[PDB]
Amino acid sequence: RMSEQGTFALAKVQVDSERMKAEEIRWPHLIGTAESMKQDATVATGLDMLYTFVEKAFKDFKVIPGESEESKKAAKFIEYCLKNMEGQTLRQFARDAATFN
Amino acid sequence: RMSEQGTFALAKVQVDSERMKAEEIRWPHLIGTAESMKQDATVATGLDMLYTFVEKAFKDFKVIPGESEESKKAAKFIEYCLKNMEGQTLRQFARDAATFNEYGLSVVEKVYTQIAVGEYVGKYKVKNLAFRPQASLSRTNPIVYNSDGSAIVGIKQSLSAFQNYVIIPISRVMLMNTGGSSSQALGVSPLVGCYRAWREKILIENLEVVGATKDMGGVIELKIPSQILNKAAMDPSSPEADMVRGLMSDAANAHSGEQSFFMLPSDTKDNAPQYSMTLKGIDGMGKQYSTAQLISDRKKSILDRLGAGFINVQTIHTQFVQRVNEIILEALNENLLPQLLALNDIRLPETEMPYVKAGEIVDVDMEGFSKAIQRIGAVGYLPKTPKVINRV
Amino acid sequence: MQNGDFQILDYTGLISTMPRVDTLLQSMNLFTEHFGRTTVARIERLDDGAGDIKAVQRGGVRQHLANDRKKIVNLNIPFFPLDRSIDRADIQNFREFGTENAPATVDAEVQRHMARIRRSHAILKSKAMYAALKGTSWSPDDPVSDYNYYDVWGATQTTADVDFTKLGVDPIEVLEAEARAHIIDWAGDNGDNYEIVVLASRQWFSALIAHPQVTGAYSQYPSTQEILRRRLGGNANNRIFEHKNILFIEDISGNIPAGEAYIFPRGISRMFEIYYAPSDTLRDANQAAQELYVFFKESNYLREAKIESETSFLTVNNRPELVVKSTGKF
Amino acid sequence: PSDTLRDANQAAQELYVFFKESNYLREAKIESETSFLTVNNRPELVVKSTGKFT
DSSP states (O other): OOSOOSOOOHHHHHHHHHHTSOGGGSHHHHHHHHHHSSOSHHHHHHHHHHHHHHHHHTTSOOOOOOSSHHHHHHHHHHHHHHTOOTTOOHHHHHHHHGGGO | OOSOOSOOOHHHHHHHHHHTSOGGGSHHHHHHHHHHSSOSHHHHHHHHHHHHHHHHHTTSOEEEOOSSHHHHHHHHHHHHHHTOOTTOOHHHHHHHHTTHHHHSEEEEEEEEEEOSSSTTTTSEEEEEEEEEOSTTBOSSOSEEEOSSSSOEEEEEBOGGGGOOOOEEEGGGEEEEEOSSOTTOSSOOOTHHHHHHHHHHHHHHHHHHHHHHHTOOTTOEEEEOOHHHHHHHHHOTTSHHHHHHHHHHHHTTTOOOSSSOOOOOOOOBSSSSBSSEEEEOOOSSOOOOSOHHHHHHHHHHHHHHTTTOGGGGOOOHHHHHHHHHHHHHHHHIIIIIHHHHHHHTTOOOOGGGOOEEEOOOSSOOOHHHHHHHHHHHHTTTOSOOOHHHHTTO | OBOSTTOBOOOOOOOOOOOOOOOHHHHHTOOEEEEOSSSEEEEEEEEOOOOOOOOOOTTSOOOOOOOOEEEEEEEEOOOEEEEEEEOGGGTSSOBOSSSSSOBOOHHHHHHHHHHHHHHHHHHHHHHHHHHHHTTBOOOTTOTTTOOBHIIIIIOOOBOOOEESSOTTSOTHHHHIIIIIHHHHHTOOSSOOOOOEEEEEOHHHHHHHHHSHHHHHHHHSSOOSSOTTTSOTTTTSSSOEEEOSSOEEEEOTTOOSOTTEEEEEESSOTTSEEEEEOOOSSTTTTTSOOOSOEEEEEEOTTSSOEEEEEEEOEEEEESOGGGOEEEEEEO | OOSSTTSTTTOOOSOEEEEEEOSSSSOEEEEEEOOOOOOOSOTTSOOOOOOOOO
């Protein structure tokens, strides 16, 4: 029928996963262990090369419109908004977004 | 005649298979042993590469309609429903469904909702293909059968998953499993088999680290008459005590440099000298087993089960990914689509059922494809249709 | 196969034997099966009839009728478990006893135990129907039910005794007069031409045929069913005979006491019934019962294997009136 | 954390619940555990108030 019969269990899947980690890589500590890594010349280099191509991809971006005349007008407005953020560019956003690595 | 004369014996085929496993890889424990694996840098890497191509295949999916006009309308509605789940995409579903490569099993529940405003007002979409994590399932009996071991009536979820810090009918659930026949509800995880090799691989790596740390070859040894050592211990304010304290610090700092040398008294009391300084070495033969090649054999042993053994250097890896894609498509084509059309009373013949086709995992070769079109085109065997034109 | 230390020999074959298990009553299909939910059952009786009218003077008093009669009963059901276990020592170093050198496998022992349990359950079910036909339930060492249907419903056991030593008297002339008259007068409903069947011990059936009357009946002209030159019931183990619109059957099983025979009619509605109750398990509790439950468990620690089987049923005879204890004298 | 060997020194959750079946179809059990402390870090800004009535 039209009724959920369960939960995603977000609050449990986390609490099992924090135990099954060495204690130097649990949430409140991983922020420090990341920046105390990176200063390894093989770890920095791997991250730097990854960001090199991510920035390249989101530099010459394009907006693909539909077939109707309404979509073409909407696509032009989208391109203006994404290219006119006050003090921000998609390259900066892409290199901030990619920090989940 | 028209009568069954046997049972699938689901409830027995399981109970033999749980005994014939080492106890660290039986159902209620395998959930922990999987996540205590993965943290091996060869095991993670094999699973990550597998999910890389599974997500790619189910990204640019397509629905292939039939010939009649009715099928074409149904195909369009199917594409809308599969691309408009509230908060879900097929890439997320594909990467949740493919978890049976870790636990032999995957549970997805189908929820339908009515449309309020849109192109198909009055019809029923699918709200979410709700993934039920294997860890949140029942640790005792996950799957419940008939009074006999013939068929499955539903799947049980633990009551502890409804808390912050029940039996779901089988008709609502899409089951995917691998590594076993149709009579093994709890499929065989690809990590079964690897397990013994992973246990050895780890132990050997531990021996290498401690072995390299403890190879004190060339360490400095000093011999001093015990008269000086004993006098210092009982007379802290005697000249012997000062020289002993100097040795304990000078010897620690004894490196090789521009001014390194040694000067010792040359007195002799017996066949052996009073003072001496020698650099130790292994009096015999060193280790023989060459633990390096032991690890390499076990790494190739693990990656082969996932088809990703080529990193140790159409392919085996590409054919392995196709297996996972086909299992997901069977559940999607045969369990969701017929039911989804039934709710919106779209009843069609067998030959007019549309089906979903996954994308291609290997990129098209521009050099090969361009010259393939010419060779077919120069003879006239290629039809003039927009389908061919849009391929460029 | 190995002979003495320095010699060999040839293995030839295997010989196996097992006692017979009877299925005649099962074959006759005289018992209807009911699958309940609880362990208690109810039966409703409603007996009616009529009286006689006496003459009275005209214009005076009148006469009045009586009323009907009702009865209600309740019953319980017994339980029958059966378990066994398997240990390492039973297969550690024992040769399979089949091929020359195949080691003993757990599967073979499991199949042996399956066969033994099935045979035991079949034997118990067979004995249950024989006990029920005699007018009492089968529940050894379980005085909880011990139901004597003759006492429970209220009745008496008709004898219809026969003597075979009188060569000048046909035994059938007593069976007819007593048994068939009693059955007709006690059918309860308004029927006709009920079929009569007889179960006889080996001694009784054998003595009956040898009686001079029966032999003289068929000797002087062929007729059919040639007793003298053919065999009763052909080559089958269970002999069959039919004389004077009656069917006679020999009890190979030997459950019937030697010399005794039971006479009962066919066709009567709901004379025999059997009920099954669920087992003591959460899966089957309060559910629909089944004929037999079998379970098997392999220890997750690899050091044990166990087998489990249980069942629960009751056999009920709803009319003790229509069973006659024929007894022979020799 | 709960006292179970799964999460010894691993993490914490508000409420753990477990359901068990004997696998012999003859028994089941229910479990639940919690472990928490309620702390008022500043016992300075809570003021008692007692009242004499009548």
